[PDB]
Curated annotation (Swiss-Prot):
It comes from Homo sapiens (Human). The lineage of its organism: Eukaryota, Metazoa, Chordata, Craniata, Vertebrata. GO terms for cellular component: cytoplasm; cytosol; extracellular exosome; membrane; nucleoplasm. Acetylation impairs ability to promote interaction between Akt/AKT1 and PHLPP1. Deacetylation by SIRT7 promotes interaction between Akt/AKT1 and PHLPP1, leading to suppress Akt/AKT1 activation. The gene is FKBP5. Immunophilin protein with PPIase and co-chaperone activities. Component of unligated steroid receptors heterocomplexes through interaction with heat-shock protein 90 (HSP90). Plays a role in the intracellular trafficking of heterooligomeric forms of steroid hormone receptors maintaining the complex into the cytoplasm when unliganded. Acts as a regulator of Akt/AKT1 activity by promoting the interaction between Akt/AKT1 and PHLPP1, thereby enhancing dephosphorylation and subsequent activation of Akt/AKT1. Widely expressed, enriched in testis compared to other tissues. It is found in: Cytoplasm; Nucleus. Its main location: cytoplasm. Part of a heteromultimeric cytoplasmic complex with HSP90AA1, HSPA1A/HSPA1B and steroid receptors. Upon ligand binding dissociates from the complex and FKBP4 takes its place. Interacts with functionally mature heterooligomeric progesterone receptor complexes along with HSP90 and TEBP. Interacts with NR3C1. Interacts with Akt/AKT1 and PHLPP1; enhancing dephosphorylation and subsequent activation of Akt/AKT1. Interacts with IFI44L; this interaction modulates the kinase activity of IKBKB and IKBKE. Interacts with IKBKB and IKBKE. This is Peptidyl-prolyl cis-trans isomerase FKBP5. Residues 30-118 form the PPIase FKBP-type domain.
Length: 128
């Protein structure tokens, strides 16, 4: 399925080239521009654990998730992955725990040492 495919066929987007975040572009976005550090970014996403369970979805909330890019307000994989995206792009990200929640995990649903799968849509970005 999609998690296996990004695991086996994804592109390493890390600056360390440590395989910690792998990406596949699913829907090509618009233009060439990617967001700027500090921009307000608006995303829709769904996240799955490696046991197949969905642990989060903004679609199910009927509102996007908003954060300031490159500030550590989200897991490292999202700061580095969203920075690669164009407006309107949809990608898959396969994130090792060192770029996610590490040994701590995150209650209620994310265990220790978890590799995570996300589908992310970059809806918009704006400098404030
Ligand atoms: N910390 C995070 O990366 C995050 C992203 C979306 C929802 N909750 C947490
Ligand atoms: N974060 C990146 O890899 C990147 C590269 C070029 C332009 N925008 C983002
Ligand atoms: Cl799938
Ligand atoms: Na595929
Ligand atoms: Na891109």
């Amino acid at each position: 399925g999609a998690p296996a495919t990004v695991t086996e066929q994804g592109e390493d987007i890390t600056s360390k080239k440590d395989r910690g975040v792998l990406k596949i572009v699913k829907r090509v976005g618009n233009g060439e521009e990617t967001p700027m550090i500090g921009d307000k970014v608006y995303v829709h996403y769904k996240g799955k654990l490696s046991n197949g369970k969905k642990f989060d979805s903004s679609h199910d909330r009927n509102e996007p998730f908003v954060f300031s890019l490159g500030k550590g307000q989200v897991i490292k994989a999202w700061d580095i992955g969203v920075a690669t995206m164009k407006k309107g792009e949809i990608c898959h990200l396969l994130c090792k725990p060192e770029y996610a929640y590490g040994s701590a995990g995150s209650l209620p649903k994310i265990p220790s040492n978890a590799t995570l799968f996300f589908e992310i849509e970059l809806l918009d970005f704006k400098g404030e």
